[PDB]
Swiss-Prot record, chain B:
Organism phylogeny: Eukaryota, Metazoa, Chordata, Craniata, Vertebrata
Protein's UniProt name: Acetylcholinesterase
Keywords assigned: Cell membrane, Disulfide bond, Glycoprotein, GPI-anchor, Hydrolase, Lipoprotein, Membrane, Neurotransmitter degradation, Serine esterase, Signal, Synapse
Disulfides per UniProt: 64-91, 251-262, 399-514
Catalytic reaction list: acetylcholine + H2O = choline + acetate + H(+)
């Protein structure tokens, strides 16, 4: 029976799912950990203990407890990212799509959803893995992990809420793939982990953590890297925020045991309701509970590890989208609106920069402002909007990633960099937002291949080439098929630093993705803020 | 006689000079002060005591003692700025050009040579005032003033070497024009002072100083302003350099009088030989003995005076040239040469900025570097050369001048700004240097009008419209006679290009870079 598979933890029964006139096997909602509920909250995950009988894996699992975006009720553009299943702390499950007939020992790709480490689900429609698994004939896994306080509350020293448990949930799912994927036709020796945003930062964190390294072969990072300013905090900041969450709930702060005990007595939604109150400053692209540099999951500072080459050395394929910052400006910066061209006055521009770089001193602010202001036309509402868009995206995504690619490449065994700049013809968001953070995902999962979604013929072709690039990279460590005819995606080298645009037009090779601004963000600004 | 004039100090006999197939009156080397020699060295100037008989004013006077540029012997490009006659401490004289027949109460223009306060002469060929005086019919006066230690050694507190005597010499010459120009047909109530580089900074300083305000009507500043970083120093820095000058010459440093008496015994060239050793850093566009903010000639700091509006309120006309920095890079920065394109390597670029902003810390240097480096092509030699060229010019001339123009305009009564970007066709310097610092002067003085100089017809026309803009401005406060040179206003901040093509109006001259040099860097250096 193609649909009946017995794993190290027990039997599982999948379901036959239709896909583009054909069919594939799907194993949805398989548990990989014990429900981190009750006294398990904030605690490191524990392996799912063996069960008897056949586990029904024909339906999606619950999504983890998280903040839900209600800015635009009914609007598909935002709701497509909200939980589409009931939320529950009992959410540590994974989904698998296996080609039919079952391959023998084929390439495996594991998906790690993003969502700022405070949200995300493995069950969104945009993550349906049937199209990719079917078209590229790979075994596609979709994992999950605790987000927000439930997954990253950090009180260093304690073993009840040590921090990074969300990252540990991911590792456990990878350990599960390593031990049972062979039973689904996949080769545990050829697994590629890929994710976007927080998922992309996660992938890079596994590349760094000695405890995750041997659990995968290669890695793909989309609009996210481990060194992003929003992707981690110091143990001190983590404790400070943890204590602040308690204070917000009138918790006994006399000790970690009592604080944790108090927080374990609260209902999920109670934690979530005050989640954003613990942040240091008014800001955008900043999240309360994220990974912490604990000295355990992460031996030393991320930077020192990148400089010494202390990390998995393999091949990586990463990149960013043209307008990474717009999504976040729309939600937290004045002057921005979904139903308007959002021309930003000078007053709001100033406010935006303060909001975008919350940790900067007045001098740092002036520096950012001067670096992104055309003083021959400072009141230009459009230049001010786009300026802010670039500030947010360069600071939070692009430059941190460029820093990462340059450091990694000095020790790695293969780097391929991309710049996704295609505005989908059917985008529901306003034109000013451009190529939005997260909108390359639908192309990666082949949504353009389904006719009723109304993508253009050229968008279907773009999707097919991106999927083939991803899959081929997963299988061999090179997105290009040797001795093939199509244009070749060149390797990123420390000297030439090449990268390609990713759109519907013929390939174009560029060099030094946004070096000017990134030199500012990665070299000059830090030195300025470090002075006094 | 048309050539015999009785001044309040005595009679002077001029000389009839030829000019563009015609003639005009010339009075050369008229003494306006007592020879500041011997015990008068470093001391404020004293008015020239009356003389009997007729003073021979038919030939140029001596040039003040100064460092002489011997970098390119025989090369006319560097030599045209060197003293063209005997140097002597007895050099306080002035020259006048009067149109023939002698006009009545006509407009006067007083020229103040530049030279970084360490050099310059009123006798240079390019300062020949006959062309401008004749063509525009104005009485043209060129004055002189002590430069170097002789004119600016500052030992605040002492009255033997109080500092700023060079500026005081300029003042006495203006005071002399105020009392005697009418006798040459000049109108003392309509006097315009104009100068280039250090000459422009001087003009600016007179606009600021109370004791100078009533000695002129309007002002013109060419490639120089009072607030330039090389134009002045604190009393503390002036004293330090003064003491260090003595040290270099093994002087008794126990007290001011002992220090001064020692320095007064040395021969001129002994002082000049060690002049540069007193600078605090290795650098370019930096000079040893310059004006001092003494609380006397300058009531308070230049900036505070500019904010409170404490200065002469009138009409000003000022501008800069496209490539102000090339000249100084050629002389003190590695990688530059007069006989090559001078592509600057990356290492030399680094060295260059350090030399350009000697006072900046490492963060400041990184800031200047990032601000002027295209990181998509950092190893481009031409881009590094031009970048260094803009750094030196933006920091030392253009931006300090824009800061001055914006501050002045708030209280002034009329501002006219220009951007001179014409590359002379017969220029002897290499092309990489572009529109060099000081090369608009030949156009202001009508040199293109003389055939033998081989300028193009378009350049002659350019020179004529420039002389007319200058002269018309001097006589009415507006370079336009009733394409119009728009007025620079706080709001629109307009300015015009000055070249051989039809006039073009622009706004916010190099505002991007100047925002960096006038607001961000200062703030960054004060914070770190
Ligand atoms: C598994 O669940 C699906 C969906 O609820 C259902 O159709 C199927 O019959 C179930 N299988 C069994 C026998 O539990
Ligand atoms: C990757 O490693 C292999 C084996 O050491 C080496 O032969 C190859 O050149 C490397 N490739 C790259 C792009 O570094
Ligand atoms: C003035 O001096 C010049 C040159 O020394 C001489 O030619 C001239 O005759 C003198 N003036 C007169 C006429 O006495
Ligand atoms: C100059 O002053 C006069 C009289 O005070 C005034 O009418 C005129 O507007 C002023 N000009 C400018 C442009 O400031
Ligand atoms: C990233 C910070 O994890 C943000 C991800 C956001 N969505 C909307 C693309 C899921
Ligand atoms: C200014 C610093 O006074 C420099 C002027 C230099 N010349 C060569 C034009 C006289
Ligand atoms: C990115 C994002 O929507 C932030 C969450 C919104 N607040 C802070 C208003 C709850
Ligand atoms: C441009 C100029 O003559 C600079 C002065 C040269 N040194 C420093 C050698 C005396
Ligand atoms: Cl970088
Ligand atoms: Cl002649
Ligand atoms: Cl001689
Ligand atoms: Cl105004």
């Amino acid at each position: 029976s193609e649909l009946l598979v017995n794993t190290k933890s027990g039997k599982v029964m999948g379901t036959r799912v239709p896909v583009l006139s054909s069919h594939i096997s799907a194993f949805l909602g398989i548990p990989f950990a014990e429900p981190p509920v009750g006294n398990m909250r904030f605690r490191r995950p524990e392996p799912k203990k063996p069960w008897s009988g056949v586990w029904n894996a024909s339906t999606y699992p619950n999504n983890c407890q998280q903040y839900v975006d209600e800015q635009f009720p009914g609007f598909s553009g935002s709701e497509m990212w909200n939980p589409n299943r009931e939320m529950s702390e009992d959410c540590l499950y994974l989904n698998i799509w296996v080609p039919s007939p079952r391959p023998k020992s084929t390439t495996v790709m594991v998906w790690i959803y993003g969502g700022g480490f405070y949200s995300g689900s493995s069950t969104l429609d945009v993550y349906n893995g049937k199209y990719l698994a079917y078209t590229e004939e790979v075994v596609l896994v979709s994992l999950s992990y605790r987000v927000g306080a439930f997954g990253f509350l950090a009180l260093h020293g304690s073993q009840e809420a040590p921090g990074n448990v969300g990252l540990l949930d991911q590792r456990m799912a990878l350990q599960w793939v390593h031990d049972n994927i062979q039973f689904f036709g996949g080769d545990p020796k050829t697994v590629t982990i890929f994710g976007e945003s927080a998922g992309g930062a996660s992938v890079g964190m596994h590349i760094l953590s000695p405890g995750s390294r041997d659990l995968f072969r290669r890695a793909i990072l989309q609009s996210g890297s481990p060194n992003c300013p929003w992707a981690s905090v110091s143990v001190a900041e983590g404790r400070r925020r943890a204590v602040e969450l308690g204070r917000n709930l009138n918790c006994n702060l006399n000790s970690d045991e009592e604080l944790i005990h108090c927080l374990r007595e609260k209902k999920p939604q109670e934690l979530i309701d005050v989640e954003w109150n613990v942040l240091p400053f008014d800001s955008i692209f900043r999240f309360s509970f994220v990974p912490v540099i604990d000295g355990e999951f992460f031996p030393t500072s991320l930077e020192s590890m990148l400089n010494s080459g202390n990390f998995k050395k393999t091949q990586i394929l990463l990149g960013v989208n043209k307008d990474e910052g717009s999504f976040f400006l729309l939600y937290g910066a004045p002057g921005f609106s979904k139903d308007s061209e959002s021309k930003i006055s000078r007053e709001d521009f100033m406010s935006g920069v303060k909001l975008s770089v919350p940790h900067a001193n007045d001098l740092g602010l002036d520096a950012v402002t001067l670096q992104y202001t055309d003083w021959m036309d400072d009141n230009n509402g459009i230049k001010n909007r786009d300026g802010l868009d670039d500030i947010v995206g360069d600071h939070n995504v692009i430059c941190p990633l460029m820093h990462f690619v340059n450091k990694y490449t000095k020790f790695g065994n293969g780097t391929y960099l991309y710049f996704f700049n295609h505005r989908a013809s059917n985008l529901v968001w306003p034109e000013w937002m451009g190529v939005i953070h997260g909108y390359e995902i639908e192309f990666v999962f082949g949504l353009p291949l389904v006719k009723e979604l109304n993508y253009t013929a050229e968008e279907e072709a773009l999707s097919r080439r991106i999927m083939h690039y991803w899959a081929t990279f997963a299988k061999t460590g090179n997105p290009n098929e040797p001795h093939s005819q199509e244009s070749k995606w060149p390797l990123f080298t420390t000297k030439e630093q090449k990268f390609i645009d990713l759109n519907t037009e013929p390939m174009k090779v560029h060099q030094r993705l946004r070096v000017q601004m990134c030199v500012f963000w990665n070299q000059f600004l830090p030195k300025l803020l470090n002075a006094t």
